[PDB]
Ligand binder design. Structure first.
Ligand code: 4OW
Length: 127
């Protein structure tokens, strides 16, 4: 059961912007989660072949990970902050959909999500 191609991170025809909110999502939100001790399972797309999870991409149909988010922010791929915030939320929700309460991977996502929520609570107003 192969891995699908990763989510898109480059598209020259996509309208995109650099807003102060998107700068905050890279410089504060992404950077804080990325350096966390629990970040590594989320730093790249799930390799469901190497992890022996043949059902993963049959259940998770909108995959997302912080490696993809990092590339999108570095490429200024987004139009607005909500688009990027949705990518984070997709990543967390996907984790809770696929896994069981109290699993190690869920505990790791919950720690990252708590920090995520604390940082987006202080999202600056758009200038
Ligand atoms: C982002 C994400 C979401 N969902 C899952 N679900 C998952 C569920 C079960 C397993 C094993 C399957 C064979 N079983 C024998 C043990 C468990 C699995 F490999 C992964 N994985 C994720 N990313 C990830 C990336 C690298 C690794 Cl090494 C792991 N492994 S892990 O066990 O979750 C960890 C060591 C606690 C981090 C996960």
């Amino acid at each position: 059961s192969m891995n699908p191609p990763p989510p898109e991170t480059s598209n020259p025809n996509k309208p995109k912007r650099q807003t102060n909110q998107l700068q905050y999502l890279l410089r504060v939100v992404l950077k804080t989660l990325w350096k966390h001790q629990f970040a590594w399972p989320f730093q790249q797309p799930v390799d469901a072949v190497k992890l022996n999870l043949p059902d993963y991409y049959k259940i998770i149909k909108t995959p997302m990970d912080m490696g993809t988010i990092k590339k999108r922010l570095e490429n200024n791929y987004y139009w607005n902050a909500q688009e990027c915030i949705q990518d984070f939320n997709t990543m967390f929700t996907n984790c809770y959909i696929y896994n069981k309460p109290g699993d190690d991977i869920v505990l790791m996502a919950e720690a990252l999500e708590k920090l995520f929520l604390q940082k987006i609570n202080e999202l600056p107003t758009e200038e």
